[PDB]
């Protein structure tokens, strides 16, 4: 009932930036917090950063706080993530996920999209 | 605001179980859901469970969803985290959070416990 589409995954150099994009349809109004998670090749799906729906207040893990900001808009029922001085251990496949209100965990996930970061 | 403290947790052998648990004090009324991460060697840390403090729901993500199981006991303070069926890739020191209402993210930590397979 609530639909999720990452966009802007792609290939970047070592110190460079790139933004991700997920759009949100169905009844967003019954979201609290939206968060970007990351799977690199082999590995676990790992948090990164959250923020709240209707708050735009922000968290973020130690491994990305200071180069990635999270950040909404209500209007365009968008999140993004900007990622500044990414590396190589950057590379993985990105999924934007929605948590409901009064719900608990992530109840609903996009496709993915891949980004990579070259030395 | 709120100080947690863990306890639990040690040398286990492959195929076995561990229990892990912690404590809350203080604005303990506050505190919207709970949850378990995990730090190797190294590594990042990496959300596990989480359980809602006042409605009891869980989640768990596909790396420990079927084996791992969440639980809280609201009146003695206290979360809990049983771990069944563990592999050595659960090798790990175990961190619990908790989430202030109307806040995000994980706001208090608790000082972590090791979980060695
Ligand atoms: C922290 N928090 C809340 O405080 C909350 C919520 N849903 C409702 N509320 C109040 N969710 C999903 C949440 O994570």
């Known amino acids: 009932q609530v639909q999720l589409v990452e966009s802007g995954g792609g290939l970047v150099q070592a110190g460079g930036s790139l933004r991700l994009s997920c759009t949100a349809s169905?009844?967003?109004?019954?979201?609290?917090?939206m968060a970007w998670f990351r799977q690199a090749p082999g590995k676990e799906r790992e948090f990164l950063a959250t923020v709240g729906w209707s708050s735009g207040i922000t968290y973020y893990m130690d491994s990305v706080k200071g180069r990635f900001t999270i950040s909404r808009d209500k209007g365009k029922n968008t999140v993004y993530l900007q990622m500044d001085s990414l590396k190589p251990e950057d590379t993985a496949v990105y999924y934007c996920?929605?948590?409901?209100?009064?719900?608990?965990?992530?109840?609903?996930w996009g496709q993915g999209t891949q980004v990579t970061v070259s030395s | 605001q709120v100080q947690l403290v863990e306890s639990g947790g040690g040398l286990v052998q492959a195929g076995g179980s561990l229990r892990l648990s912690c404590?809350?004090?203080?604005?303990?009324?506050?505190?919207?859901?709970?949850?378990?991460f995990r730090q190797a060697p190294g590594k990042e840390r990496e959300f596990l469970a989480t359980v809602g403090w006042s409605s009891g729901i869980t989640y768990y993500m596909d790396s420990v969803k079927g084996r791992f199981t969440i639980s809280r006991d609201k009146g003695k303070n206290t979360v809990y985290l049983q771990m069944d069926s563990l592999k050595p890739e659960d090798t790990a020191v175990?961190?619990?959070?908790?989430?202030?209402?109307?806040?995000?993210?994980?706001?208090?930590?608790?000082?972590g416990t090791q979980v060695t397979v």
């Open positions: 996920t929605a948590t409901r209100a009064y719900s608990v965990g992530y109840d609903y």
């Open positions: 169905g009844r967003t109004g019954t979201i609290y917090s």
